[PDB]
Amino acid sequence: IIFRLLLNVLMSIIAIISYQWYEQLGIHLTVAPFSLLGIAIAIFLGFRNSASYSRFVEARNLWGTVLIAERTLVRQLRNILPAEHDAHRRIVSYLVAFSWSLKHQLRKTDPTADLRRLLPEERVTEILASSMPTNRILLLAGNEIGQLREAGKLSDTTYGLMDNKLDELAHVLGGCERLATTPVPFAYTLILQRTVYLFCTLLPFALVGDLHYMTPFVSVFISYTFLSWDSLAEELEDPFGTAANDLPLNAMCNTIERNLLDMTGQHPLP
Amino acid sequence: SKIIFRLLLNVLMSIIAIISYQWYEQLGIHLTVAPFSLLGIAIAIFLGFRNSASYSRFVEARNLWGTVLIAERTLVRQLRNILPAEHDAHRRIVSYLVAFSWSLKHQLRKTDPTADLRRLLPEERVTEILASSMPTNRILLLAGNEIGQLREAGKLSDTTYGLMDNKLDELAHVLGGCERLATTPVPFAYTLILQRTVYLFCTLLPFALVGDLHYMTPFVSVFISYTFLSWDSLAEELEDPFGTAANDLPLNAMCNTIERNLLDMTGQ
Amino acid sequence: SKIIFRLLLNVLMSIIAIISYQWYEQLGIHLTVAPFSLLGIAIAIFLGFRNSASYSRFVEARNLWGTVLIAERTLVRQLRNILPAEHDAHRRIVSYLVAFSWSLKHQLRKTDPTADLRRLLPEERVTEILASSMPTNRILLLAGNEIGQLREAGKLSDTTYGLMDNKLDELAHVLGGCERLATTPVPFAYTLILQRTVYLFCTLLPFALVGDLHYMTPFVSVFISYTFLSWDSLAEELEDPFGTAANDLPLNAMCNTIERNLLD
Amino acid sequence: SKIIFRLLLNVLMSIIAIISYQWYEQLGIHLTVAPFSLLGIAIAIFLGFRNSASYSRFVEARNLWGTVLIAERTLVRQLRNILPAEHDAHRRIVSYLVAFSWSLKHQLRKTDPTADLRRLLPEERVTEILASSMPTNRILLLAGNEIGQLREAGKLSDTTYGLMDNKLDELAHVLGGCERLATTPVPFAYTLILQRTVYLFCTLLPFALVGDLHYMTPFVSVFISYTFLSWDSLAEELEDPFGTAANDLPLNAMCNTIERNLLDMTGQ
Amino acid sequence: KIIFRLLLNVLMSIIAIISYQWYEQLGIHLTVAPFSLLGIAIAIFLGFRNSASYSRFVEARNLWGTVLIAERTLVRQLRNILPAEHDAHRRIVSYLVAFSWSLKHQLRKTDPTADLRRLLPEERVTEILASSMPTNRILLLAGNEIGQLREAGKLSDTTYGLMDNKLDELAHVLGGCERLATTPVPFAYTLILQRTVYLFCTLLPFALVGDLHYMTPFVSVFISYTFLSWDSLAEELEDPFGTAANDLPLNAMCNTIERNLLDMTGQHP
Ligand SMILES: [Zn+2]
Ligand SMILES: [Zn+2]
Ligand SMILES: [Zn+2]
Ligand SMILES: [Zn+2]
Ligand SMILES: [Zn+2]
Ligand SMILES: [Zn+2]
Ligand SMILES: [Zn+2]
Ligand SMILES: [Zn+2]
Ligand SMILES: [Zn+2]
Ligand SMILES: [Zn+2]
Ligand SMILES: [Zn+2]
Ligand SMILES: [Zn+2]
Ligand SMILES: [Zn+2]
């Protein structure tokens, strides 16, 4: 990815050799048109990166919500039903399974190992048999809260109170799904990039007349700026993508798992 | 896309510029990139904002359909958790929800939903739905009738009824939101003004440049024009979210997803 | 609208510049483009942001009316699902909700809502409503009176009463929001800076463009003028979305749509 | 406002730049336009973003007060619909709400609220409230006390008590919101950055413009200065939305409207 | 510390002035117009980024306000619904205050043991310090007070709901501040950005010098002051929980909250 900076620092060299056998032909290149084009592209990059950042933020918010919902849900389970600890274990397993399964869903990885670690094989087989595993997990948690309801351990009021949290989690799932099926531009988001590329490659060809052989330095500077901003944009557009960062999601799933364990007395150890 | 018309027309004007540059002093006419830069800058800025609007709105449509999926899922989930034995009810309400999805899709797309409705629901109900001048809202009303029936039966308390009714509300905010998007577009005096200015600017910019560029104008003028037009475009696409075009929302696939999801949660 | 006038104006100013250009020499006036480029780009930016704010106001107003339709719909639906056999209260409540929509429309469009109220409600409480300084809110209080008259003696429990009350508050938030957008506008430094700032820039512009544009000059000055005037003007009507202009909200159509929906 | 006392100054800096223009090379100082175009554009952008923040702050305030009006309206409405015979509660709670509006308004305006309280409330509770360092919150507490008495009296079920408590939450969020906007101020730095960067830029501009504009320097300099200073002064009271200046929130009018409304919604 | 590299680019401007015919000998030329373009782009990017940072600051402050609000309404409900259970008022309040301080320390990455021991009995403090999220544990303990309050019939499930909603508000606050703490602005943003501003500011005089001559350092220091100030302000806003000048007075907010909860329970400091 330093390859294009390099690439045509070399166009800045070809630019100069190119500048020299010159005016026999009609080619001329001033700075003012590429300044206009460059400002326009900069503006477009500004807006675009803004949208990308907005997507990133929304993802981080949704996952934050996961953590929050699962914490409050477990808290409620402890405050309302302080004695039902096998239900605690199960429901917590389900929430943690929801988190991991979600990560694996967004990252197109296999959730099988994490599920098999957290849940009994019958319910793991069922969830993996489904094409929408995470929703099946939520459904199963719901089944647990409902079982607590028909047993008379939960009134419908407090059942409501926990159902609200499961809603929160559902909204999250849907939101992350929408953000994953995205982005919305049908690979036009790409189109701009090659516009930036062609602009950065033709730029030293237009500065050369004025900057002479300071050209590679100024051109690699400007190219660095635009290209870096573009790549930042593309990585923000794709928070759950193939070339995205492992740390957000993994730490979030670990964080919540730890939290839940700690809340349920499974932590800490005797 | 259609964008080849802008670029080749611009090439041709660029050529007219090349050949007719020698007749500028004799008419008096000469041109500076300087004023043109100002113009194209103010335009670049406007386009940016107008695309903020278009994108925001596109996104809002995606959000709404997302809310369909979420609300229906949770509604079925609640039905299972509260009334796990009422499977007939389950599949009645499911059928209405899927019908709501399809009818919504059909409405935003101006297609006859009679076939899908009669595929999901018994004929009497289809009649009730098509009798209304607002079929999708009456679909909500019929799902609401089922939930209500469950309430009067005593199977649902007013609390749990309320819990489900909230989901019906979410669905209603969806229907309204989609209708509002459908009928209220981004004021396209935006698209009017911007199209005029951008077009005139792209046809005038080989004339904004010519003297300076010569043998290298179709390449640079096309490059600039293309940038503005490929950019001016992201409105074409980000404002037909309910259209059938390749770039609009795959409402067919979304509805399929919803139906498959609600049938997955009911064992069929 | 009258943009054309101020465009024509630019054009005459432009010809003046054309005939006066090298008499700048005899007057000691030199004017290059670069400072006007700066000023014009700053103005463009500012016009960009203001326009964005306007559009936002427009969008939220629209949303508030969308919320009207949605709240009233669900409220009726709840009435038919919880109390399917009390059509009496249903027609009363619906007539109130519709009178609410029209009264609100007339309130934001400064107009007399008497006729439509009479058309939708019985004379007695049309006089009660017109007696109030805030009719729309009075209408809401009446619809609430209907629902309370449904809680009182057993048909609605507290819970389901809550379910309908919530929707009445959705509506009340709409009322408050619309009042906020209508009563408190944008702070009138808004074209109170952008009016001459933009036209003064557009009329002084050909004086600086004549140097280099020479003969082709007015075309470009009317072009730039068109752009800035047309954008500062798109703020014209997006800032008053309850206004009567073309790009303002078709509130009349929206109410019709609302009561068509409730009467179906 | 007193912005013209910066325009006259600018005209003086312009005439000084005119009379000193070609001691420039005789002093060794050269000033082209391009760096001031760059600098001016950057400043313009930053001004645009700052002014945006300011605008959004003012709007937030407006929304807050709108929420006060709404929440109080709905609270009184609920009181009349749930407890139509309890005109005592109507009276005392409405007084408490109006008192909340005024207390908040005086709190934001840094004025004494006691006259309005004595006008609206009996004195033992007024002294109670004035004794507390957070009076407004205390007024919410008291309103809550009465809704709580209605609950314990069995006139309100826990459900209905919840339905009004949600309105007290709405009001509390408002109080916390206004307190936030007032105590937490704007990040000042934007103002120290733009005040001197704009002022300095406006005064230094004619020295870089005199070269090419010559005698036309004061007009163009005072114009550009007028634009940047007018945009900066457009911000000035928006980042302080609770101020007494003419172009900020009519909190008097708003609180009069509120009291007017709550008395209209009770029959006075 | 902006004065350090203000002086530096002043010095680098002096390096440009006192000197440079070297390119003319060398063949290297540098005009303003390309640096104008680059400077405008950078200015745009700085604008957007600063805007985002500000948004983050505003989010933080908003969240803390929500702490104060949620706690207030929680105490209010506790007084209005259970006026006689005053020991519970004091305990729950001490929990809410402990929550505020522990959150402060959590965002500041400091030890909350002193403030915990100040507000809570040693057993609870020990129970809390063992948790991976002490604030969460605090919420869980307050909830246990409210839940205990539910099971001897002192609160109905509905009213227990009403308060639990406030605990959910608080938990949303916690999750959001946690997210603003763990979510740095992506480094790639300042990696490009601020280095690009420093480099732009130090290279600018070399390009301004050909047209400005001896005026270079004044225009260069002006521009550098602008860009660096704007940038620095953005830095400052991105870390709203830091001890730096432009950042949240979490101490002031915490004792404002404590004074408030003490005000509402008739108690004095
Ligand atoms: Zn446990
Ligand atoms: Zn642990
Ligand atoms: Zn939902
Ligand atoms: Zn079933
Ligand atoms: Zn609603
Ligand atoms: Zn009926
Ligand atoms: Zn001429
Ligand atoms: Zn409300
Ligand atoms: Zn009364
Ligand atoms: Zn009495
Ligand atoms: Zn709250
Ligand atoms: Zn107490
Ligand atoms: Zn929550």
Author numbering:
A (entry chain E): 24 to 293
B (entry chain A), D (entry chain D): 22 to 289
C (entry chain B): 22 to 285
E (entry chain C): 23 to 291
Paper text:
Human bestrophin1 (hBest1) is a Ca2+-activated Cl− channel essential for Cl− transport in retinal pigment epithelium (RPE). Although the structure of hBest1 is still unsolved, two Best1 homolog structures, one from bacteria Klebsiella pneumoniae (KpBest) and the other from chicken (cBest1), have been previously reported. Overall, the channel is a pentameric assembly with a single ion-conducting pathway, which varies in diameter along its length and is constrained at two narrow points: a “neck” contributed by three residues (I62/I66/F70 in KpBest and I76/F80/F84 in hBest1/cBest1) on a transmembrane helix, and an “aperture” formed by a single residue (I180 in KpBest1, I205 in hBest1, and V205 in cBest1) on a cytosolic helix. Here, by electrophysiological and structural analyses, we show that the neck and aperture in hBest1 are both indispensable Ca2+-dependent gates, and their dysregulated opening by rationally designed or patient-derived mutations causes Ca2+-independent leak and elevates Ca2+-dependent channel activity.
A patient-derived mutation of hBest1 at the aperture, I205T, was previously reported. As threonine has a shorter side chain than isoleucine, we speculated that I205T, like I205A, enlarges the opening at the aperture and enables Ca2+-independent leak activity. Notably, the threonine side chain possesses a hydrophilic hydroxyl group that is capable of forming H-bonds, which can further affect ion permeation. To test this idea, we solved the crystal structure of the equivalent KpBest I180T mutant at 3.2 Å and examined hBest1 I205T in HEK293 cells by patch clamp. Remarkably, the aperture of KpBest I180T was dilated to a size (radius 2.1 Å) bigger than dehydrated Cl− but smaller than CH3SO3−, while hBest1 I205T conducted robust Cl− current but no CH3SO3− current in the absence of Ca2+. Moreover, hBest1 I205T showed a CH3SO3− to Cl− relative permeability similar to that of hBest1 I205A and retained CH3SO3−-mediated trans effect, reaffirming the critical roles of the aperture and the neck in ion selectivity and CH3SO3−-promoted channel opening, respectively. Therefore, our results indicate that hBest1 I205T is a gain-of-function mutation due to incomplete closure of the aperture. Interestingly, asymmetry of the aperture is observed in the KpBest D179A and I180T mutants, suggesting that “breathing”, which manifests as local, asymmetric changes in the aperture region, may additionally contribute to accommodate large ions, such as CH3SO3−. While mutants with conformational changes at the aperture (e.g., KpBest I180A, I180T) or neck (e.g., cBest1 3A) do not have structural alteration at the other restriction, a mutation near the aperture (D203A and D179A in hBest1 and KpBest, respectively) impacts both gates, suggesting both independent and cooperative regulations of the two channel gates.
